[PDB]
């Protein structure tokens, strides 16, 4: 990423997430690190790659719902994480829209 | 009719329930009550109809665009025969219900506790003083919305006392006795409910036209919001 | 409705996740401390107010509230320390001078700090029955020299309040 | 205070002094509500859903009774929401809340009530300081700036016919030491001194004579008392930390001269 090799960085990041070698607790951070690559003017993540990232985001959300006994949904760390998640959803939706247009324009 | 109804009511009250002779007398008592209230209805409606037919020579004044709700409604009741006669039918039916309410007002004074939700308040105070196990979760707050907001029950005695009170408040409102319903709410420690029963009053500011003496403003300027609530 | 510990903690976590800086998180700490106190979670209240005091060291209300938390734990010396700091930052808190005197007399009557705080309280509340009781407790510990001063104190309080049953019984 | 009011221009007749004073009181009430808007939105954002009573109190101290009512309703406090809906224009309701506070104190039930909630009832009753049965003093003005404190005096402590000068005099008594009680209001400091924790240590009467007042309080005094001292009003220290900043003081003097104030000495001019 520092050497501005964004395509290769994006592929590696996706591989790290899909290889399930990353600790579940680190998945949000990894997704957040994908955020700058998702918001680039140039489509770095393909539609397929973006779907995978979306799946990873959903898997996490699902994992959080299974680990939280109904008696700890009340203390002040759920609001920041929710904001980060919304930001990621928006970025993923925007990239997906861009990637479909670009991939579709190349197939015509 | 009322003299004979009063005589027959005294006769029926003096007799042990179950003699077949007095079932006929009770039926005739009801029929004479129906006659009495029918005469009251005839007097109310035909008095209005005859008076209205004499007044149709006068051009009704249109409400000014800055008229209070009370002034608009006062002009509606002058102009509109349907609205006026329909209200006389309401006033008549409220008068019958008032004649039935009778001395039953006095019996509620024996059950009207001086404090709202006294038993729930007692149980909450006792829970604050003794950690003794397994009593049914009750509301933690004493505002009227607490049972709804928390989805927690009141004490069973307070719930019974509220059901009784609400039935009687409905009977007083059905009898046109809204002021006595408000006094009863205030006496039972439910001054908030007495305030909800005031919100129907039409907005009126007697000072809009520059009178020589300042008069009190009456009614709710946001009556529409109160009505939606 | 008392807010549950879990509701307060979710509110604190959401209020901490929305804060842009560590300083902004600590600035909300006094509100969190009050919520934890209303929930009787005194340890979480202390952590929350201590995190606020580290950013707003000159707030007398935070030092007063921290002193109240230490007093409820029976840690009288730390409570007195926090109350002294609150009184230094805002000297208009006359009530805190009386509470410091009461707490010092409760901890150790033979503490030479007790005479200073009781006499400072006496100047703020002339003829308070509570100050008379604190002066009685101090002088009762001093033997014969305490006896003459206690006699003079009782005569002065009976001159101010001839109809006080307790002072008359003590004489 | 002095500008053209559209409501006074809409009448073809010379507006009676009472009508002028009423429209001026409304304009000043709107000014107070607008000055508190930024700070109330900040405070309400900080209190969150758990401290809804403090956020309701904050809206009441900005005159936003409608938003206080809606917040109370959304939080499930339907009793408080009903109470607040009845506060617009009924003196009888204020007297009933005052009786309710007295009865809670006599019955020693007030000590079981949350302080923030009692503070809302004290505000609605028009009592600035309440002594609970536990000997706790509930001060309505303790967390308020001098502008919101003055607004609470204008809206809740005084009748709707009361003049701006009556509100100012009541607020002045609230921060002065009197034989009848401890000062319960903040002193009207300029905004660059409002955050200076001037620890009012044990001798307050000799220090207030040295503390400069906010220019807005000097203007409210001049409006109430036509002979009020212009030397203190036009001092740069009433506005700015810089004693050489004569920008506002000079322009205020030109406007006051246009309003026919002439009692500033030629030396000070």
Sequence-distant (6+) residues with CB within 8 A of B155 are: B117, B119, B120, B122, B123, B138
Collapsing DSSP states into helix, strand and coil, what is residue C73? coil
- For D177, half-sphere exposure in the C-beta direction (CA atoms, 13 angstrom radius) is 10
Q: Output b/e per residue, A24-63; b: 16+ Cβ within 10 A.
A: eeebbebbeebeebbeeeebbbbbebbebbbebbeebeee
Q: What residues form DSSP beta bridges with D130?
A: D138
Do B150 and C2 make contact, defined as CB atoms within 8 angstroms? no
Tokens standing for B85? 């006669």
- CA-nearest residue to D203 within chain C is C92
Distance from CA of D76 to the nearest CA of B (A): 5
Instruction: Residue A71: name the closest of C77, C31, C9 by CA.
Output: C9
Contacts of C59 in chain D (CB under 8 A): 197
Candidates D51, D114, D199; nearest CB to C90: D199
Collapsing DSSP states into helix, strand and coil, what is residue A25? helix
Contacts of D110 in chain B (CB under 8 A): none
Backbone angles phi, psi at A50, to 5 degrees: -65, -40
Residue with tokens 């001026």, as numbered in its chain: D24
Contacts of C6 in chain A (CB under 8 A): 71-75
- CA-nearest residue to A71 within chain C is C6
C7 reaches B (C-beta below 8 A): no
Sequence-distant (6+) residues with CB within 8 A of D129 are: D122, D137, D138, D139, D140, D181, D184
Task: Please count the other Cβ atoms lying within 10 Å of the Cβ belonging to residue D18.
Answer: 9
DSSP string over chain D: --S--HHHHS-SSPPPHHHHHHHHHHHHHHHHHHHTHHHHHHHHHHHTTTTHHHHHHHHHTTT-HHHHHHHHHHTT-HHHHHHHHT-SS-HHHHHHHHHHHHHHHHTT-GGGS-HHHHHHHHHHHT-SEEE-TTS-EEETTTT--HHHHHHHIIIIIS-TT--HHHHHHHHHHHHS-BTTB---S-----HHHHTS-----S--HHHHTTSPPPHHHHHHHHHH-TT--HHHHT-GGGT-S-TT--HHHHHHHHHHHHTT---S-TTT-
Q: Give how far Cα D201 sits from Cα of D93, D102, D129, D224, Å.
A: 40, 33, 21, 32
Dihedral angle of Cα C123, C127, C131, C134, to the nearest 10 degrees:
120
Q: What residues form DSSP beta bridges with D137?
A: D131
D196 reaches C (C-beta below 8 A): no
Residue with tokens 């019955």, as numbered in its chain: D107
C-alpha to C-alpha distance for B216 and B205, rounded to whole angstroms: 7
Instruction: Residue D144: name the closest of D131, D159, D155, D160 by CA.
Output: D155
Strand D129-131 with D137-139, pairing? antiparallel
Contacts of C18 in chain A (CB under 8 A): 79-80, 83
C-alpha to C-alpha distance for B154 and B119, rounded to whole angstroms: 9
Q: H or E element: which one contains A17?
A: helix A6-18
Tokens standing for A67? 């680990």
Specify burial of residue C101 (Cβ count, 10 A radius: 0-12, 13-18, 19+).
Answer: buried
Sequence-distant (6+) residues with CB within 8 A of C8 are: A74, A75, C32, C35, C36, C39, C41, D50
Going by the DSSP 8-state scheme, the letter that residue C25 receives in this structure is H
C-alpha to C-alpha distance for C20 and C26, rounded to whole angstroms: 11
**Contact call for residues C63 and C100 (beta carbons, < 8 A):** no
- Which chains form contacts with chain A, at 3 or more CB pairs under 8 Å? C
Distance from CA of B141 to the nearest CA of C (A): 5
Tokens standing for D48? 């969150």
**Contact call for residues A99 and A45 (beta carbons, < 8 A):** yes
DSSP string over D150-170: HHHIIIIIS-TT--HHHHHHH
Contacts of C13 in chain A (CB under 8 A): 75-80
Could you tell me the resolution of this structure in angstroms? 6.9
C-alpha to C-alpha distance for B38 and B50, rounded to whole angstroms: 18
Tokens standing for D104? 């809670």
Tokens standing for B71? 């002034």
Residue with tokens 């029926």, as numbered in its chain: B12
Do D79 and B192 make contact, defined as CB atoms within 8 angstroms? yes
Do C9 and A76 make contact, defined as CB atoms within 8 angstroms? yes
Tokens standing for B88? 């006389």
- Which chains form contacts with chain B, at 3 or more CB pairs under 8 Å? C, D
Tokens standing for C47? 């952590």
C1 reaches B (C-beta below 8 A): yes
Candidates A71, A75, A83; nearest CB to C13: A75
Contacts of B115 in chain D (CB under 8 A): none
Relative orientation angle of helices D91-106 and D115-125, to the nearest 10 degrees: 140
Instruction: Residue B188: name the closest of B112, B119, B103, B124 by CA.
Output: B112
**Contact call for residues C167 and C157 (beta carbons, < 8 A):** yes
**Contact call for residues D139 and D185 (beta carbons, < 8 A):** no
Task: Please count the other Cβ atoms lying within 10 Å of the Cβ belonging to residue D144.
Answer: 20
Tokens standing for B187? 């006496």
Residue pairs spanning B and D at CB distance below 8 A: 36
Do B144 and D81 make contact, defined as CB atoms within 8 angstroms? no
Technique used by the depositors: cryo-EM
Do D51 and C35 make contact, defined as CB atoms within 8 angstroms? yes
Q: Which of B140, B142, B145, B208 to mutate to test the interface with D (most CBs of D within 10 A)?
A: B145
Distance in Å from the first CA to the final CA of chain C: 51
Instruction: Residue C34: name the closest of D46, B36, D11, B33 by CA.
Output: D46
Do D48 and C7 make contact, defined as CB atoms within 8 angstroms? no
Tokens standing for D161? 């016919």
Residue with tokens 């100050």, as numbered in its chain: C131
Kindly give the residue spans of alpha helices, DSSP state H, lying in chain C: 5-17, 22-27, 29-38, 42-53, 60-72, 76-89, 94-107, 112-124, 129-140, 143-160, 165-170
Instruction: Residue D238: name the closest of D220, D257, D258 by CA.
Output: D220
Distance from CA of B156 to the nearest CA of C (A): 20
C-alpha to C-alpha distance for B156 and B120, rounded to whole angstroms: 9
Tokens standing for B78? 């002058």
Candidates D79, D93, D112; nearest CB to B144: D79
Tokens standing for D243? 């004693």
C-alpha to C-alpha distance for A28 and A80, rounded to whole angstroms: 12
Do B195 and D86 make contact, defined as CB atoms within 8 angstroms? yes
Residue with tokens 């919520």, as numbered in its chain: C35
C-alpha to C-alpha distance for C142 and C151, rounded to whole angstroms: 13
Do C14 and A71 make contact, defined as CB atoms within 8 angstroms? no
C-alpha to C-alpha distance for D269 and D264, rounded to whole angstroms: 7
Instruction: Residue B105: name the closest of B177, B40, B53 by CA.
Output: B177
Tokens standing for A86? 């919304």
Tokens standing for B56? 């149709």
C-alpha to C-alpha distance for B203 and B155, rounded to whole angstroms: 39
Task: Please count the other Cβ atoms lying within 10 Å of the Cβ belonging to residue B120.
Answer: 22
Instruction: Residue D113: name the closest of B119, B141, C30, C31 by CA.
Output: B141
Dihedral angle of Cα C97, C99, C100, C106, to the nearest 10 degrees:
150
Contacts of C16 in chain A (CB under 8 A): 76-77, 79-80
Residue with tokens 């005091």, as numbered in its chain: C53
Contacts of A75 in chain C (CB under 8 A): 5-13
Instruction: Residue D77: name the closest of C3, A47, B204 by CA.
Output: C3
Task: Please count the other Cβ atoms lying within 10 Å of the Cβ belonging to residue B133.
Answer: 4
C-alpha to C-alpha distance for D71 and D77, rounded to whole angstroms: 9
Instruction: Residue C89: name the closest of D204, D199, D203 by CA.
Output: D199
Q: What residues form DSSP beta bridges with B204?
A: B218
Dihedral angle of Cα C163, C165, C166, C169, to the nearest 10 degrees:
110
C17 reaches A (C-beta below 8 A): yes
Contacts of B217 in chain D (CB under 8 A): 89
Q: What is the CA radius of gyration of chain A?
A: 15
Contacts of B146 in chain C (CB under 8 A): 1
Collapsing DSSP states into helix, strand and coil, what is residue C40? coil
**Contact call for residues D219 and D259 (beta carbons, < 8 A):** no
**In chain A, what's the furthest Cα-to-Cα distance?**
54
C-alpha to C-alpha distance for D164 and D24, rounded to whole angstroms: 8
CA A96, chain centre distance (Å): 11
Distance from CA of D81 to the nearest CA of C (A): 15
- CA-nearest residue to C2 within chain B is B140
Do B149 and D76 make contact, defined as CB atoms within 8 angstroms? yes
Going by the DSSP 8-state scheme, the letter that residue C20 receives in this structure is S
Candidates B145, B191, B221; nearest CB to D96: B191
Q: What residues form DSSP beta bridges with D138?
A: D130
C-alpha to C-alpha distance for D202 and D210, rounded to whole angstroms: 16
Do C88 and D199 make contact, defined as CB atoms within 8 angstroms? yes
- CA-nearest residue to C38 within chain D is D114
Q: H or E element: which one contains A104?
A: helix A78-107
Instruction: Residue D144: name the closest of D227, D35, D238, D261 by CA.
Output: D35
C-alpha to C-alpha distance for B200 and B223, rounded to whole angstroms: 6
Distance from CA of D29 to the nearest CA of B (A): 20
Sequence-distant (6+) residues with CB within 8 A of C12 are: A75, A76, A77, C32, C35, C48
Collapsing DSSP states into helix, strand and coil, what is residue C135? helix
Three-state SS for D6-56 is HHHHCCCCCCCHHHHHHHHHHHHHHHHHHHCHHHHHHHHHHHCCCCHHHHH
**Contact call for residues B208 and B68 (beta carbons, < 8 A):** yes
Instruction: Residue D213: name the closest of D116, D146, D157 by CA.
Output: D146
Contacts of A78 in chain C (CB under 8 A): 10, 13-14, 17
C-alpha to C-alpha distance for A47 and A95, rounded to whole angstroms: 8
Sequence-distant (6+) residues with CB within 8 A of A81 are: A28, C17
Relative orientation angle of helices D164-175 and D215-224, to the nearest 10 degrees: 130
**Contact call for residues D153 and D186 (beta carbons, < 8 A):** no
Do C14 and A79 make contact, defined as CB atoms within 8 angstroms? yes
Backbone angles phi, psi at D60, to 5 degrees: -65, -40
- Which chains form contacts with chain C, at 3 or more CB pairs under 8 Å? A, B, D
C-alpha to C-alpha distance for D240 and D218, rounded to whole angstroms: 14
**Contact call for residues D27 and D5 (beta carbons, < 8 A):** yes
- CA-nearest residue to D84 within chain B is B192
Q: Give how far Cα D230 sits from Cα of D241, D258, D262, Å.
A: 19, 14, 10
**Contact call for residues B158 and B173 (beta carbons, < 8 A):** no
Collapsing DSSP states into helix, strand and coil, what is residue A1? coil
Going by the DSSP 8-state scheme, the letter that residue C28 receives in this structure is T
C-alpha to C-alpha distance for A58 and A50, rounded to whole angstroms: 12
DSSP string over chain B: -HHHHHHHHHHHHTS-TT-HHHHHHHHHHHHHHHHHHHHHHHHHHHHHHHHHHHHTTS-PPPPPTT--HHHHHHHHHHH-HHHHHHHHHHHHHHHHHHHHHTTHHHHHTTT--SSTTHHHHHHHHHHHH---S------S--STTHHHHH--PPPHHHHHHHHHHHHHHHHHHHTT-HHHHHHHHHHTT-HHHHHHTTTTSPPB-TTTT--SS----BS-TTHHHHHH-
Residue with tokens 């001037």, as numbered in its chain: D198
C-alpha to C-alpha distance for C45 and C53, rounded to whole angstroms: 12
**Contact call for residues A50 and A43 (beta carbons, < 8 A):** no
**In chain B, what's the furthest Cα-to-Cα distance?**
80
- Which chains form contacts with chain D, at 3 or more CB pairs under 8 Å? B, C
Residue with tokens 């707490």, as numbered in its chain: C103
C-alpha to C-alpha distance for D160 and D141, rounded to whole angstroms: 20
C-alpha to C-alpha distance for B143 and B151, rounded to whole angstroms: 13
């Amino acid at each position: 990423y520092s050497q501005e090799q964004f395509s290769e960085a994006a592929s590696l990041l996706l591989s790290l997430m899909t290889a399930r070698i990353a600790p579940c607790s680190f998945w949000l951070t990894l997704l957040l690190d994908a955020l700058p690559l998702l918001e680039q003017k140039q489509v770095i993540f393909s539609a397929e790659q973006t779907y995978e990232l979306m799946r990873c985001l959903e898997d996490r959300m699902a994992a959080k719902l299974e680990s939280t006994s109904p008696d700890e949904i009340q203390k002040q760390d759920s609001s920041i994480d929710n904001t980060k998640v919304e930001m990621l959803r928006l970025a993923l939706a925007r990239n997906l829209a861009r990637a479909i247009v670009t991939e579709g324009a190349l197939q015509e | 009719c009322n003299t004979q109804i009063t005589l027959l009511k005294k006769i029926v009250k003096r007799v042990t329930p179950g003699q077949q002779k007095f079932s006929k007398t009770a039926s005739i008592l009801w029929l004479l009550q129906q006659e009495m209230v029918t005469w009251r209805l005839i007097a109310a409606l035909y008095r209005d109809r005859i008076q209205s037919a004499l007044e149709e020579e006068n051009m009704f004044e249109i409400a000014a665009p800055n008229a209070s709700e009370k002034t608009i409604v006062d002009k509606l009741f002058q102009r509109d025969t349907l609205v006026r006669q329909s209200q006389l039918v309401v006033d008549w039916l409220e008068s019958i219900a008032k004649d039935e309410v009778g001395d039953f007002s006095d019996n509620i004074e024996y059950y009207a506790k001086s404090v709202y939700w006294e038993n729930t308040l007692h149980t909450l105070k006792q829970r604050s003083m003794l950690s003794l196990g397994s009593s049914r979760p009750l509301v933690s707050e004493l505002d009227p919305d607490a049972p709804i907001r928390q989805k927690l029950p009141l004490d069973d005695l307070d719930r019974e006392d509220d059901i009784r009170l609400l039935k009687y408040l409905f009977t007083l409102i059905r009898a046109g006795m809204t002021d006595e319903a408000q006094r009863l709410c205030k006496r039972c420690g439910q001054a908030w409910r007495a305030a909800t029963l005031e919100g129907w009053k039409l907005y009126h500011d007697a000072n809009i036209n520059g009178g020589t003496e300042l008069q009190a403003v009456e009614g709710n300027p946001y009556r529409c919001v109160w009505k939606t609530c | 409705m008392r807010r549950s510990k879990a509701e307060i903690q979710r509110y604190v976590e959401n209020a901490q996740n929305s804060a842009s800086s560590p300083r902004e998180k600590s600035m909300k700490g006094f509100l969190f401390a009050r919520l934890y106190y209303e929930a009787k979670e005194y340890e979480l209240a202390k952590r929350s107010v201590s995190s606020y005091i580290s950013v707003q060291e000159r707030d007398p209300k935070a030092h007063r509230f921290l002193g109240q938390l230490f007093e409820i734990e029976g840690n009288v010396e730390k409570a007195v320390g926090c109350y002294k700091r609150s009184l230094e930052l805002n000297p208009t808190q006359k009530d805190l001078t009386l509470r410091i005197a009461e707490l010092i007399c409760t901890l150790n009557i033979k503490d030479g700090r007790a005479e200073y705080w009781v006499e400072r309280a006496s100047k703020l509340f002339p003829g308070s029955p509570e100050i008379y009781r604190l002066k009685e407790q101090l002088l009762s510990s001093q033997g014969e020299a305490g006896w003459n001063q206690l006699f003079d104190l009782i005569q002065a309080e009976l001159f101010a309040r001839p109809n006080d049953v307790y002072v008359n019984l003590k004489l | 205070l002095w500008g053209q009011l559209k409501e006074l221009e809409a009448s073809l007749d010379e507006p009676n002094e009472y009508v002028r004073n009423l429209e001026r009181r409304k304009a000043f009430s709107h000014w107070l509500a607008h000055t508190a808007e930024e700070r109330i939105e900040e405070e309400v954002s900080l209190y969150g859903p758990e401290r809804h009573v403090e956020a309701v109190f904050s809206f009441l101290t900005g005159g936003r009774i409608s938003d206080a009512c809606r917040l109370a309703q959304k939080s499930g406090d339907h009793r408080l929401s009903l109470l607040l809906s009845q506060m617009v224009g009924s003196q009888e309701m204020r007297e009933l809340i005052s009786l309710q506070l007295v009865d809670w104190n006599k019955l020693q039930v007030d000590h079981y009530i949350q302080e923030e909630r009692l503070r809302v009832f004290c505000l609605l009753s028009g009592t600035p300081v309440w002594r609970s049965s536990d000997n706790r003093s509930i001060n309505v003005c303790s967390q308020l700036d001098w502008k919101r404190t003055l607004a609470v005096h204008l809206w809740y402590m005084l009748p709707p016919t009361a003049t701006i000068a009556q509100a100012l005099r009541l607020y002045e008594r609230a921060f002065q030491e009197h034989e009848e009680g401890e000062p319960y209001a903040c002193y009207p400091l300029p905004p660059y001194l409002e955050d200076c924790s001037i620890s009012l240590g044990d001798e307050p009467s000799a220090k207030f004579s040295s503390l400069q007042r906010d220019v807005c309080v000097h203007l409210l005094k001049l409006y109430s008392e036509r002979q009020y001292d212009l030397c203190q009003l036009l001092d740069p220290s009433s506005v700015t930390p810089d004693p050489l900043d004569y920008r506002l003081s000079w322009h205020l003097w030109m406007v006051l001269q246009a309003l026919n104030y002439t009692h500033l000495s030629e030396h000070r001019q």
